[PDB]
Symmetry: D2
Subunit: 445 residues, 4 copies
């Protein structure tokens, strides 16, 4: 053609057609072949993408995910669909069914967690539900009665078992838990992970995604799998992990999300007359983690830093996670204006060569930047959506609209890619990525 | 709410979400519970609804339908999905696998046909394909190489076995073959069908659709099932049906569709360098049936009449089938202007009480009109789409746009109903009707 | 016939067509016949309306208004179009040309003021300009250079001459300064306005709007025109009005708008490197007037109260001005929930008879309510846009969107009415109202 | 920066803003500076542009034009705005006021004609009026009553005084009458135009458009202005022009437009019960001019040829005027397929360097092609709209839609240019061109 792009109605139709095609029945895979199981924070966004189409089916997505919740509250980052292959590491390597005392009985799950965006999904379902009338409000509200206690247990587990010293920051024991697997953020902590006798394995992800420049390297995967052996050797016991894991970092992006989530959950809890003590705790957590995020920021730029617990040192990198405090609030006026100038300037959204005015995962002027390699440079619709929605919540209506408009424009070819090359716009990663389709549907409300 | 309607992007998304949810794998049911199998002219419209979403999946819908084609060319009106129940009459009553010499080996089908809209689906797939670039044009074009000969056999069977005297009109042996089961069109022919020893049966359609005023009556169903016994007793042999069937009528609406279809197939055949003899025959048929439709029309109003072969009399009724000549062309200038005035006036689209300016299936001032009862009055999106698309083909751009706009407005509540009450807009029939969702997607291109 | 509403592009086109049709060259009349001159806060919304069409002409609109600013900083509420009559009271009745020491010389203006929404217009122009490229950005930055000093003198005149005791609320000397001429808010205050020898006059407004139920009474105009005589007798001198004016009320809605306008101007001042002393003054007024608004609020509902300076009494009425604190923030979390609940509940937006989910000027359950009568009941697009824009600034993205979407639906008949009957939707006041067209252009984008 | 294009509602608003900005009161200038008067076929498109905005003002536009009609029926191609200069040749140079027996008295006009697109404007007004209700319908029906006799005298003057031998083609006495002033179509004819003692002059057009590559040469203007002297020497007398004019060509594009215009007027005449004798005349001219167009056509491609009356020779050029028969129909099926194939192929719309799938005025492979130079290459929104509307009338719904969609994409930069560089998209000619704005308003609806 002369134009290979789609109209907004065509695009919304194709996006809904992808989400239904990735539906197994009660769960939606993050991707048809690359990720043929339910991932934790993908399921939350799939629920957002489904809320315009069927509030009852979006409630089901979350229902299915909470039924995989561990006995201590942890929401695992993968719920394995029964009998599916083609993804490594599968439940055999995790062995949580055998080893994890808190693992659920009805499901096969991984042994690590992922950021708590689930409250954001609940509010979007609620907002759609209130525009659809009496029968549909009842479905969302019944969900709240079924799962409020389980949402609380999820937030309580993060606040108490992953913030053991009440520092207002979430501790991670695997890079995978950040959702940003190979981010330059973790390079200096992964450098101190020394794999021992690691059992033989073959990769699956790079049989599907065959370009080596779009996925993590083989050395990187050996370390991801070694941390798994460490957790296994201790039967996934929370009390014992701090003493054995050779990867312990406080994730500032994860912490900022949790702050926002607690605040969102707190407001839902007020709107629907939930136990006062739960609401007060949620507000408590929301402020502790807001303050924890702010304690990491550079005094001049506002840029948030992660923290290496084993090294006892701030990790200074130039990735989009520096902008964590923009999501949760709490910076002094002057510092937040400096942080926004960093975001809008030539190190990020204002880099002269970007095809779209979107946020690259790593700054193109960082020595660590790689235009194609997963989290080392590419632009992700997941970050566009999250930043856009959080900005609207801060009251930055025009900034949020600009992100939403550039995201829709990048997505308008219908690739629904996992991520995009920052300079050429080339769709990279998995195509048919549920999460990208869900961003599009939410942006086209 | 204050407004229970959807935006165009929301509506297109919901429509695509319905079509994918009604997908069994290779076939799409006409409706989730009411019609849990593939119907012949529904599959053609589903292919149109799918062409914006996936040209390859729309090709598959047609591929699946032609694989059910009989050995003489007849496309049957139902392809039964294997192991499905909840629809009567199912393959056990038809018994075509046992009795029909021309029945296909790989499928269970009914023993009657349905209007040949399939060429229209092929052109829409082609038009979408040419806007999507080189790989997707190849998929549509390979379809044409696979199935051109089977499309020809389909049109050839209608022209030769259902127009045995070359009168330019299609003969039907069941009301179901018209697609308008209980239309007042057939009342005076059904009155001369006298059921004999008809084996016991229970209805399914009215266990699903429980309001008696939306479906045909019990007396009506006994006659539909009796004609089935007549066809069975003669093993569905084309040569023997004229001598035994107690229902034989020439369908003018069906004939007009066939004329249009031949013309559309002829033009495709020219564009893609198909055998010259096939194209010349298609143009031949297109003009024979155009002329056959025109031979039925009232000299003053242009209204087309059906013909009772057994009675040897014109059937004069006031339903939307009178407007058949508007679809295929061929009327003298003055007669077509009179036919359009009938369509736009108070007997149809201009009736003062219509909620939308759409075409009711039966004129609200006919003695036969029933606002709720299937084809005896309700407004159907299927007719809106067909009339709208045929009008655009005649060059009546503004008329086609007005139909398309009123149809989109009626559909904007998201019911995707089979048909709508003409006065209140109440959604009737099956909800989640594939065909209504496909009209919406095509209208929102 | 079936649906007298316009598509979004038809509506946007008709809105722009209206705004250009009300342009006299360098000023835009607020309405073709009823208000055939430039009104102050109307002109700010016209500028907002023009920013998507022409940044240059939107700057011109503000430049024209600021060229009429008084020498002490006041922006007068009417700038009269040269040689234009048909509005009363016209320049001859105000006599500011001959009496007022501070009046401008190139221009004929009124002698009172109106809410400082101008900072919001400037912000929207700048946001539009930033999306349009370098030439267009230069135009808006040059406007800032030309007018920043004038915008300051405007805010400083309000902060020092209308808040003479640093109470953080703006004192009005005329109901007209509030923009809600006949609101129930002022009835207690007006009843203590006893006119003496008031020079004869004939109204012009009810010659154009002849329905008496849509305009203020003859008795009300007598008090409006008498307040002019009191200011005239003292030559519009600021120092003397507190001694002679029979009408002195602190306006909490005006005050909240000023709080927001100061914060908006202060942030503009920071992004474009205006003098630090000005930015500091602007932040200090933002906070004082936020606090001054909150100090009026009802301890159970959070509803803001106006104050009668002469009687030293709080004015307790049931109008849209109660929601002032939602615009500028500042309420404790719990009272703000209560206030939103009053907004959304059965006394305002959730009232069961309302055609649209919009804010009535006066509550429909108030003894003071009148569905047709100006600010005593009707729904104003004016209020919708302001609340929608301010809610988005608060971070209430979904609330802002529901207001915007109901506004567009009420406007979709293309009447562009000054105000609308809350129960029936009937358009009231002047048609072709510039402000309504501007709101639509801004919402549609 | 990243994307200088406008959304559909922003674009529709800017188009309406432009059209109102070019309104002088009762006439709309074709462009602000370049064409500061009313041009005949421009004014018909402006009327089309205004019908969605105000049926009343669109009627006024046509009424103003028809008030300048000559006494023999000719509609002159320029109606001069009183006291306006800056265009040459102005009223003083034409001298129709003093020389022309048939010129109007209330008005100053040119002395030549232009294509009869007026019937199409009338049709679009009527279609808009029918959707707007009774008051608006009355306005358009009253226009018909007022002007039907004038529209007839217009078509009759063309049919009898410009087709003096009933050949079914319109004779032009000036290239300007064709609306394609410097098209290669006329170069052979112009080379036999030898000017004598031609009174001195200074061009105005290239003072506004100073780039010489976008306008006709000084040599061409000398021939244009000399043809004026030849008509002046004979006082614009129709009977005498055939004897004295050095330029006499039958214009096949003009003729096809007339064929369509007659058919459109004849159908208007039937729907509104105009005199049967007029309707009959209109149908008879529709057919004669259809046949006269077809008689010129190339036997292999179907391409229409203009005819040089003086030299008795067919003019064979490679311009968009070759596709005249597609507008009015009439070609045998096989030659029309060939003609569409030439339109869609590599010499016109399918040329590989074209930025948009639009029709260049001259084929890019022609020796005559010039990408910047007026009608010698550039793409005209004028042509797009006319072909798109006529294709839809032919029943070519998808072809019409692809033209419309490429037109909108080229217009989406908001330049509203007179014509566009075919390879780069650069806007050329006058910006703010009324006709371009009108096309956009009509396409967007």
């Amino acid at each position: 053609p002369h134009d290979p792009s789609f109209t907004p109605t065509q695009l919304a139709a194709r996006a809904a057609y992808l989400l239904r095609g990735n539906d197994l029945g009660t769960m939606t895979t993050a991707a048809p072949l690359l990720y043929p199981h339910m991932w934790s924070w993908d399921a939350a966004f799939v629920a957002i993408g489904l809320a315009p189409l069927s509030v009852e089916r979006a409630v089901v997505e979350l229902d299915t995910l909470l039924s995989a919740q561990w006995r201590n509250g942890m929401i695992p980052h993968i719920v394995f669909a029964n009998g599916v292959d083609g993804y490594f590491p599968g439940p055999a390597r995790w062995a949580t069914a055998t080893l994890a005392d808190n693992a659920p009985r009805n499901r096969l799950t991984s042994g690590i967690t992922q950021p708590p965006v689930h409250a954001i999904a609940v509010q979007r379902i609620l907002e759609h539900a209130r525009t659809r009338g009496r029968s549909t409000r009842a479905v969302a509200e019944a969900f709240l009665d079924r799962r409020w206690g389980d949402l609380m247990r999820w937030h309580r587990w993060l606040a108490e078992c992953r913030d053991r010293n009440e520092r207002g920051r979430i501790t991670l024991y695997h890079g995978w838990e950040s959702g940003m697997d190979n981010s330059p953020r973790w390079d200096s902590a992964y450098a101190n992970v020394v794999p021992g006798k690691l059992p033989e394995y073959q990769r699956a992800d790079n049989v599907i995604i065959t370009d080596p420049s779009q996925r993590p390297s083989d050395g990187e995967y050996d370390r991801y799998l070694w941390l798994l052996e460490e957790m296994k050797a201790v039967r996934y016991d929370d009390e014992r992990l701090p003493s054995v894991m050779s990867f312990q970092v406080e994730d500032v992006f994860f912490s900022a999300i949790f702050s926002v989530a607690c605040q969102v959950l707190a407001e839902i809890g007020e709107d629907y007359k939930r136990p006062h003590a739960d609401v007060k705790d949620l507000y408590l957590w929301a402020e502790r983690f807001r303050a924890g995020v702010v304690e990491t920021t550079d005094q001049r730029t506002g840029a948030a830093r992660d923290f290496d617990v084993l090294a006892e040192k701030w990790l200074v990198t130039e990735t989009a996670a520096q902008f964590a405090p923009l999501l949760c609030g709490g910076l002094p006026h002057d510092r937040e204006r400096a942080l926004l100038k960093l975001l809008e300037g030539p190190r990020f959204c204002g880099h002269p060569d970007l095809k779209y005015g979107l946020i690259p995962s790593t700054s193109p002027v960082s020595r660590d930047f790689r235009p194609r390699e997963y989290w080392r440079g590419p632009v992700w619709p997941v970050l566009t959506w999250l930043f856009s929605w959080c900005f609207a919540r801060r009251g930055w209506a025009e900034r949020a609209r600009l992100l939403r408009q550039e995201g829709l424009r990048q997505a308008s070819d219908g690739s629904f890619a996992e991520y995009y090359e920052p300079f050429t716009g080339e769709p990279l990663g998995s195509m048919q990525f549920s999460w990208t389709a869900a961003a599009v549907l939410d942006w086209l409300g």
